[PDB]
Amino acid sequence: MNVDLVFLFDGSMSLQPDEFQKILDFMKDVMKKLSNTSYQFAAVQFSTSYKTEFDFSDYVKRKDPDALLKHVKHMLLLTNTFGAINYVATEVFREELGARPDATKVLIIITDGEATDSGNIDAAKDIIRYIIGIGKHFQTKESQETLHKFASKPASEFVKILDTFEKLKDLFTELQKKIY
Numbered sequence: 001m002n003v004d005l006v007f008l009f010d011g012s013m014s015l016q017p018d019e020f021q022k023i024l025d026f027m028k029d030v031m032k033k034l035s036n037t038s039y040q041f042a043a044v045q046f047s048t049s050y051k052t053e054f055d056f057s058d059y060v061k062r063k064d065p066d067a068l069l070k071h072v073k074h075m076l077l078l079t080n081t082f083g084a085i086n087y088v089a090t091e092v093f094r095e096e097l098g099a100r101p102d103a104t105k106v107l108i109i110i111t112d113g114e115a116t117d118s119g120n121i122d123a124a125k126d127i128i129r130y131i132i133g134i135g136k137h138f139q140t141k142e143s144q145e146t147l148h149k150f151a152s153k154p155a156s157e158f159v160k161i162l163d164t165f166e167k168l169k170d171l172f173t174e175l176q177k178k179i180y
């Protein structure tokens with residue numbers, strides 16, 4: 001499983017303390033589970049601006065999820081998802097940062113609300129994109145469909161809607177079952 005995976009997580013002011021922590025814990029749990037594989041990880045927090053919490057080359061050093069995300073500061077601003085995706089496509093998937101030319105590129109977007117910006121995201125066309133929409137903001141079909149534009153096709157497979165943050169645990173279990 002030679003995959004270069006980037007977690008692009010929402011750090012807007014809409015996330016309460018425990019909700020942000022559950023997002024961080026989900027990323028850590030996934031990384032820990034896939035530590036003995038060819039997976040390589042990078043994580044970017046997005047709100048109004050974007051910040052690479054750790055790059056692929058950082059992950060490779062000791063593969064310590066707890067340590068890699070210990071200094072994360074909850075941004076608590078807006079939700080500029082479109083710009084965040086372009087940021088990942090142009091500033092994170094770079095060989096200079098540890099990305100592997102022959103690895104399959106995957107982007108996991110985790111958010112709890114609609115984007116506060118707009119923009120072309122063709123820069124991420126060679127990236128497999130999943131989006132995890134969490135919470136009441138996505139309780140209606142209409143709101144859920146706004147996430148389709150960020151994900152790969154078909155949305156039925158790349159868009160994951162979770163009613164609560166506790167469901168991240170359920171999602172993780174569901175994902176693990178697929179690789180046997």
Ligand SMILES: N#CC1=C(c2cc(Cl)cc(Cl)c2)C(=O)N2CCC[C@]12Cc1ccc(C#N)cc1
Pocket residue numbers: 003005030033106108130131132160175176177178179
């Ligand atoms: N579906 C799915 C997949 C992934 C994915 C990961 C995260 Cl963190 C969240 C979400 Cl929404 C999707 C993922 O990275 N890959 C690589 C290609 C498709 C797959 C395949 C797969 C690999 C490993 C596991 C595990 N464990 C399960 C499935």
